[PDB]
Design a protein around this ligand. Sequence first.
Ligand SMILES: CCC(=O)Nc1nc(C)cs1
Length: 281
Amino acid sequence: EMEKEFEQIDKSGSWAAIYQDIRHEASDFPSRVAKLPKNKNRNRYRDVSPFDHSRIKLHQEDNDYINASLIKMEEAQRSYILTQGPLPNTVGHFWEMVWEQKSRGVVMLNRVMEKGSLKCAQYWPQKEEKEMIFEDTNLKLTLISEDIKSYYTVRQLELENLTTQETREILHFHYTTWPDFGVPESPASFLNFLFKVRESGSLSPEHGPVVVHCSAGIGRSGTFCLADTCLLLMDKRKDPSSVDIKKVLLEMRKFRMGLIQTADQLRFSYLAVIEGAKFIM
Ligand SMILES: CCC(=O)Nc1nc(C)cs1
């Protein structure tokens, strides 16, 4: 059981060691499309690339590339799109992907500015009466409502395909309190946020996969998917304690490199799953 594994690693301070074994065992697949010179300005970080086998393709004939991966967790019946925070020049591609994949929710785990630098373009409207038009992908985005809470904001957006005049409602879940350095002290507000996303129907199989992002789409975004999938497997299995976090993480790393960036994020993922298991047993 993970609770006892947690105390062992914590009392022995072996987190950096566990983390390094995960790094060593992780899959490595080609990412040739990401490294084409015509895609250089579609990547925020030169060392963070989607694998070719799991990359999301845009339905535009010119250039189908976006820095985004489909993570398919077969046993949990959960899919996620993990992507980078959009760049000034990829905001149109971002919303095209949302439209094409039939996503109902966007989960954002970063602030636009952190540590005095821009981590993400401002890719949604700040006011009801000032809608955004993405001329390159022919989409219009309107803010419908905004509910600001202590730890997160939920926004109701209308996305309109200007080509077909179809409209969809998208929910934007913005976790606003992840600290600039390290991880939250307690996983309580992160779990509360994860339950809120679940309650919305955004993670349900009726819809396309949820879009999850931070700045690179591997660290905080990794923690989100890892916690959700681990808690769902504990509901599904005859024996909840057969769930090995390390195995689940390695299965997720087949689909996108680098998920969980630090030993601290790994420890936080254990704590989130351990605490979430109480509200589930
Ligand atoms: C007021 C904004 C808001 O909370 N919209 C939501 N709709 C659902 C279904 C969950 S949250």
